[PDB]
Design a protein around this ligand. Sequence first.
Ligand SMILES: [Zn+2]
Lengths: 45, 66, 260, 49, 72, 16, 116
Amino acid sequence: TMIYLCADCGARNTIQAKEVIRCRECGHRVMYKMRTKRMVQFEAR
Amino acid sequence: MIIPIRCFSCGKVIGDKWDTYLTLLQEDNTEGEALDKLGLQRYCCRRMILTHVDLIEKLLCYNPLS
Amino acid sequence: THITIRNISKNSVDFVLTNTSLAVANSLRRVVLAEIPTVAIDLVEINVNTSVMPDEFLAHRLGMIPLDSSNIDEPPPVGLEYTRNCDCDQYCPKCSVELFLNAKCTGEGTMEIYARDLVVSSNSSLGHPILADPKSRGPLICKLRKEQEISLRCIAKKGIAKEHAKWSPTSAVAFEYDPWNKLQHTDYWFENDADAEWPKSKNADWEEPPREGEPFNFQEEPRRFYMDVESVGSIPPNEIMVQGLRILQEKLAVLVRDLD
Amino acid sequence: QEDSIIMNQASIDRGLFRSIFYRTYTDQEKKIGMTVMEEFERPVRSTTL
Amino acid sequence: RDKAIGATVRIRRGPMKGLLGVIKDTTDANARVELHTGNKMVTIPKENLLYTTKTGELISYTEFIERSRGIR
Amino acid sequence: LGATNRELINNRAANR
Amino acid sequence: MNQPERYELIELMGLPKVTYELDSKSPNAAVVTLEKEDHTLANMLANQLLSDERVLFAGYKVPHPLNHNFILRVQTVEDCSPKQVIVDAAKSLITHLEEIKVNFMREWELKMISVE
Ligand SMILES: [Zn+2]
């Protein structure tokens, strides 16, 4: 479902519905969302 | 952060001289002599090499990986 | 009229403009600094950016990079058109250039991303980053560390320095006249002696110094201007000069056509 | 005049005095007793009042 | 309830051609669009916008209505 | 104390 | 948020490039409004006009720095029109710039040959 990044590893963690937020190689309880799939356009001015 | 591409006043491209500037400094060249060798004559173009602080390198030390 | 070229460098031309009014010399300076078309990265589409550099930070830096803009006014495929004027849906080889930046640091050290790392869509020598430093890298775009990636596509368009200083082909125009102040166009500020307290310019040797006892010439005007046009790299200085002179002519010609 | 300044627009375009503003919004799941009365979900018009 | 609102779009024609954005609001004639760059916010005629589909294609406005009608 | 702090910092993954 | 789009310095948005009106307050006086133009054209145009004897008055102004345009008021002798003197000055400037161009290119070629 949703993939987060272990704030220490950066490893992809597939947390599910109502599961403790923890890193499975790094036990870290802080993870980050991943960059959206939407199109990102910036003008260079 | 990282050296600006162009000067703020003169618009001269300085983003291709930071490495050269540091290398000149390593070779026992004063900052004034090094700026002279880089052909930076306008003091507006000189101030940006002189006063640049490279925070990019310090920001790269917080790598989530090793 | 007349022109004397005093020096030519790889990046600048130093000349003397004679038999011209100050208004025309100033208009040449202004048009060279403001209205000469150039190709620069305009739209950045970012797929992956795991660097410490924010996205718009990176976009602004990329737009600053000077791209080869020589002959950008010749009709395509030799030059370009303004995407607003072009008939393409969003962009095409006629009114744009595609560049690509795909960098990844897998090693341990720090990967420095330069302008030579941009990949340009092959439709002309237009839009290619200028690599003017001795190592032919160009401006330093960014720096990465292990596992940090950049993956983006740039659309470079046509424009002038009035819309954004990134489209400027010239850095600065040195511009002097009357090095001896024979016309007294400025009242020199001084404490004891204006002549001793103001350094003499290098152009003072290209004019005869004032003669002692000569009366003030109140009908004379500035007709000799020492100019120096320095290029950023995108356009050679001589082409900058010729293009400025063409653009002024075309402004006047539009005026004539509209009035007539 | 009156303590204003004129700034070069070309210098602004090249990155003079440009800045980044970061703001942070904090939220968390509340709970009272043994029943959780908050859920981080995409609310749907058909059920959420 | 307009079907255009919330749809990613690029500007087809005009001085701001080629800019990406999302239609925040829509009147009968123009759509109020949130550009991705410079926190910009514009009003652009619906006919002046290419619309982005699920497969990455860009379609015209009339094509968008013909797709939304669902007749087939 | 410095050595103990170093030990605790480096092995935070193992000690977790 | 209240920034104007920089393309508004180059796009007419339906405005006319040149507007010409007869100044009623004065005889043989006209006002020419040039949109999306600035001191580059106006300064040289006014100077060239003042090199002309048929031109009694020739001045220009930029009413506001936040609007890109300039007004040019020209008054001529009774035997001529402001429009004709403006056109003649513009043609003369075009020719002048053409000699500037030709002589620059010739001198540049000579200098480069000297370099080699
Ligand atoms: Zn096109």
